[PDB]
Symmetry: C3
Subunit: 325 residues, 3 copies
């Protein structure tokens, strides 16, 4: 067709108003007389706009259709599909540096409530400036806001600060993991490792491979006391040599604190537990004391015995101390 500019106007007699333009170079501008990208939409959208009409470009879908989706496609080993968010202060003609606390980009989800959409969004992942930007500083952070049930406004729940510190329910996390609440791990039940003349038995919630692939992990939880004993090799000597830390399963239980370690060829674990009710027994099986029991033990998977066994443990039944290596 044309050999240069191609502009579209509306109500020209009433008031000169350009709408779209196909430049000679091949760029398309909607609301902009000078597009800077293949397709630049600039028609002014005032604050008066109502949801879901508060945007420049919009795809739409319905029922089982898949048209209400926006995409970026790249077939390259070097580049990547991107959703770029550019932010600056001042104005487009004269862009100025962003200030500290200035929001840069946001991914907001709006939901209809039969009447309208939620002002401010129902859930937002935002990028915010952590400091006034300069040619020497471009600090930024990421925040995650969601709306509590029965509420109508998204609140900041998590933050990945410029320093890398993650804060849950914390605005300025000073810790690498600053939590404003409780920490919950899985309930791994009760542990058992008995090695006696009668045989070898063990109840371990993990497997040799798992522990070997999870070195340095701590697990804390609440459950009945453990039953531990090795009157033959691992727990063979010491002041109290063949003792059995015979825990009684109770509703009160106690807190297990187990961290993973290794022998260099097999999985090992450091276990700690305190609670009710525990009875200390000797190799013969006679009860020495019964009641509150506390214990620290170091168990490891022994392939020679095809099961887990205690290498050394020490603790206290009531006011009596026992050590067993």
């Amino acid at each position: 067709a044309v050999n240069g500019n191609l502009r579209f106007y509306t109500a020209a007699a009433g008031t000169d108003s350009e709408r779209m333009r196909i430049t000679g170079s091949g760029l398309v501008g909607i609301g902009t007389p000078a597009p800077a990208v293949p397709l630049q939409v600039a028609t002014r959208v005032p604050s008066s706009a109502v949801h879901p009409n508060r945007a420049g470009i919009q795809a739409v879908g319905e029922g089982t259709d898949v048209g209400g989706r926006i995409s970026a496609l790249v077939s390259s080993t070097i580049e990547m599909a991107t959703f770029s968010g550019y932010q600056s202060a001042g104005t487009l003609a004269a862009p100025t540096a962003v200030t500290s606390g200035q929001s840069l980009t946001s991914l907001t989800a709006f939901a209809y409530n039969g009447t309208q959409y939620q002002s401010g969004g129902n859930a937002s992942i935002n990028f915010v400036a952590t400091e006034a930007h300069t040619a020497s500083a471009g600090g930024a952070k990421i925040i995650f806001n969601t709306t509590n049930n029965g509420a109508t406004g998204s609140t900041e729940k998590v933050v990945i600060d410029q320093n890398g510190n993650v804060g849950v329910g914390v605005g300025a996390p000073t810790a690498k993991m600053d939590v404003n609440g409780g920490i919950k791990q899985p309930n791994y039940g009760i542990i058992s490792a008995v090695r006696n003349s009668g045989g070898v038995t063990a109840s371990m919630p993990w497997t040799n491979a798992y522990v070997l692939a999870h070195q340095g992990e701590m697990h804390q939880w609440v459950a009945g006391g453990p039953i531990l004993q090795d009157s033959v090799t691992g727990c063979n000597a010491g002041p109290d040599a063949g003792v059995k830390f015979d825990s009684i399963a109770t509703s009160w239980g106690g807190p297990y604190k187990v961290i993973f370690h290794t022998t260099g060829s097999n999985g090992a674990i450091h276990l700690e537990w305190s609670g009710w009710q525990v009875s200390l027994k000797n190799s013969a099986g006679t009860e020495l004391a019964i009641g509150m029991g506390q214990v620290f033990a170091t168990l490891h998977y022994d392939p020679a015995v095809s099961n887990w066994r205690v290498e050394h443990m020490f603790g206290r039944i009531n006011n009596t101390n026992f050590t067993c290596w």
Copy 2:
């Protein structure tokens, strides 16, 4: 079909089927933009499609709208290796899609972005495997390049300051929780008194949660039914509030009808007292106790506890 040519390159096309192509003579979606944007492009002109806003306007926003119980609004990111004509499977470690934020600093934008959420391939993809991971990058104050701070790996393991998290929660630093003050649960002839930072309902709704912090020692005693048996029946772990304090370790549990807690504390100074109230020892104190909200007494009570004050052990059930 309707083509829009310039002098003699075709720029736009409205096909008979109703698809629109900008830079593509064969669009595959309602509106496909393909005009070549070379690497030479500078910010903020490095993109195929771009919305723009100004001041108080809301035009600089890109949206996807869906009215359906089945489908959902999506921002789809497709990535492949090779070329468009001959696309091939992605490689291990290859980036798939990214959500990047650029910020002007009065002269330019930060090359690489100031903060980005990226999706990366964890393995060479095939018909048998499509593993992927999510990374979160941010720029530190005084820096000019976004660095990977967090990662949700293909296995679900979250890594904070860790590239290959082997733990379900692999943190490369300290873990901090709220300071819950000092706890007290005394049941005496003088009365029933207790200072608990939580409420029965709260503990019942937070089972299995661990809380650690530093504060002055606790004051615990039950000299009537629970603790008044065993080696040291009436016993008071009379902790003195000191600057050094000690580390509390409290995990939530239950009786089946009310909240219970397992408490641990060590530090200085502590005074062991008997039911009569005479001091048996003073100094370093350690204790493990199991308290629980007893409605019959309308307050928290100690079910059973045992510890060591200085080098003397004490027990109470």
Copy 3:
């Protein structure tokens, strides 16, 4: 140059309308009534194939940068946004969303030489936690990833409406509901000995660091610590000049160190249990050797230009010790 004008709407038909430039200045593709500067509504059926399952799509190749979609804003008030709108029913008649229904999603698709992964390879989704009304608009954020050797993204993390974050948990009851292990850095072995020969300490942290990381707990596995202060700190008590002489062994033990302060300097509460530890008096004679456990409160003392033990107590085998 060149241009064309119209007094009002301008429709394009290929039969039947495919595009339209309204009098107000809006452009609609597949919609006879656009509501934004550029509104695309051409119906895309479920039959569509990847990567053609979308209304609008940018494309890039090799070293080019056109496969990017962007939002630009130059304002102190507004910010670049990627708005995702979701409603029930239909576009003409939108209705409130249901509980648990997904609202918006950012999914990444990857080619496997034959096709793209149905459902996406990794997705950040926003989901409704309750039926919406004028009184409630509860929502949550989910993070889905695909395991190596798998072909479907699974929900790995969730930031619920209540702020509770879950790793491998659907309904996090804890602000940090983890369905697995928690691992921290291995800070080695700690040492703080103050004797007639002098004062020495092996601390993996700095006074400044500890002062700037108050209330943080660190747990790990390593050999036992070597602690003693026979001069000022642990100079009194039942066991006055004790040295908790740990022997470095493969079995080691679990350290539990939490940060505190004196009000002017960094302090720490340390706990350690394990094998093999030797109890020694100020003179240096071994009282016992074997299983050792200890609790200690150390702090950086500037008078000594190093870390020292203020008070410590524990047990070696069955014999108990305390010092302050």
